[PDB]
């Protein structure tokens, strides 16, 4: 699938970008499909680059992911915390597993979703190397902490709910504290 | 698929685009083949970019699609609503499953098809990760509302229509509220 090329009258003269480089220009980091170490390298590189251009300008993170490698998703989550910028997260299509944990880690009040998205905090039944029983639980427990921190919910309420194989509408994700406003069209105020 | 290069004469000399990037200069977004997360990614990127350049100039979506992942289709449909531009939809070949939803979702009066296209709203057989039965039923109802909203038909007429494993003609699709005009040749 070839990526389209777009040209910009500004410049200065004029420059041409693949449409994704053109989005990044403007501080948009696209997180699409399954999260693995490679996606995490890319997202982290884009994050660190955008912060180095300006530690004050907000960074928009567009999510449409079914989940992915737990350690790579944490790696992205940690970088979001470490950088200083505001982070708007924007769920398009779906945010499940590590994808929804990234959505919830946006700076408070700046976590959005389009109307028909699906949010799933339940974990699927991977890791990089096959792993011992005690280690899966450690990884799950820090998923509980992180989720409890950004939702303002108790470990017990996160531990249920995450047992339900369910998916939430964006409205429910809001009431639960994963995202902040669901927007059909842009607001007026 | 060797994509040909065309040269056009813009300011202030001559630049060379691949033919699809050239169509994007005319505010045209191609939706070809099965719709998945990647397709939805590029389409949304283009709709976002095109509104970025003008939020008033119409955007044209050319659709030849047999369907695809339901969440990915919904991601496109939602960004069609969010952006402020009018959107003509144009169907060549077929729009089936999520493809005909995008077709139906263009701004009213601006949804078109060519005369031999085939339109299906029946769902096949979606889903990036295998899902539970109540979740596939919640998506099917999200589809029902969207179709009833843009066709101005009742949920009950939508639902029993989607049960029929059939294609409609462009004429039928227009009487049903998916299309506005079926054009063989450009109008006067």
């Amino acid at each position: 699938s070839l990526i389209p090329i777009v040209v910009e009258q500004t410049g200065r003269g004029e420059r041409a970008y693949d449409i994704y480089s053109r989005l990044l220009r403007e501080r948009i980091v696209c997180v699409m499909g399954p999260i693995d170490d490679s996606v995490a390298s890319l997202v982290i590189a884009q994050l660190l680059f955008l912060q180095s251009e300006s530690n004050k300008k907000p960074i928009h993170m567009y999510i449409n992911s079914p989940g992915g490698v737990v350690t790579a998703g944490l790696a992205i989550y940690d970088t979001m915390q470490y950088i200083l910028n505001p982070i708007c997260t924007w769920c398009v299509g779906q945010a499940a597993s590590m994808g929804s944990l990234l959505l919830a880690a946006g700076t408070p009040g700046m976590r959005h979703s389009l109307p028909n998205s699906r949010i799933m905090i339940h974990q699927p039944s991977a890791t990089d190397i096959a792993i011992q029983a005690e280690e899966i639980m450690k990884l799950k427990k820090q998923l509980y902490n992180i989720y409890a921190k950004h939702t303002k919910q108790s470990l017990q309420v996160i531990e249920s709910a995450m047992e339900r194989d369910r998916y939430m509408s964006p409205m429910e994700a809001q009431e639960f504290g994963i995202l902040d406003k669901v927007l059909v069209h842009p607001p007026q105020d | 698929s060797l994509i040909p290069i065309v040269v056009e004469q813009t300011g202030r000399g001559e630049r060379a685009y691949d033919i699809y990037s050239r169509l994007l200069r005319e505010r045209i977004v191609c939706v070809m083949g099965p719709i998945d997360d990647s397709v939805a990614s590029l389409v949304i990127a283009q709709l976002l970019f095109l509104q970025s350049e003008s939020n008033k100039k119409p955007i044209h979506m050319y659709i030849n699609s047999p369907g695809g992942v339901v969440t990915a289709g919904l991601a496109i449909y939602d960004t069609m609503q969010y952006i402020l531009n009018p959107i003509c939809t144009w169907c060549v070949g077929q729009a089936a499953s999520m493809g005909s939803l995008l077709l139906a979702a263009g701004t009213p009066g601006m949804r078109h098809s060519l005369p031999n296209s085939r339109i299906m709203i029946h769902q096949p057989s979606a889903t990036d990760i295998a899902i539970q039965a109540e979740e596939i039923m919640k998506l099917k109802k999200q589809l029902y509302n969207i179709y009833a909203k843009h066709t101005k038909q009742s949920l009950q007429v939508i639902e029993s229509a989607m049960e029929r494993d059939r294609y409609m003609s462009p004429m039928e699709a227009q009487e049903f509220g998916i299309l506005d005009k079926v054009l063989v040749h450009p109008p006067q």
Binding site: I28, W90, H112 | -
Partner: peptide, 6 residues
């Protein structure tokens, strides 16, 4: 997606 992200 602007306004507001960006």
């Amino acid at each position: 997606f602007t306004p507001x992200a960006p």
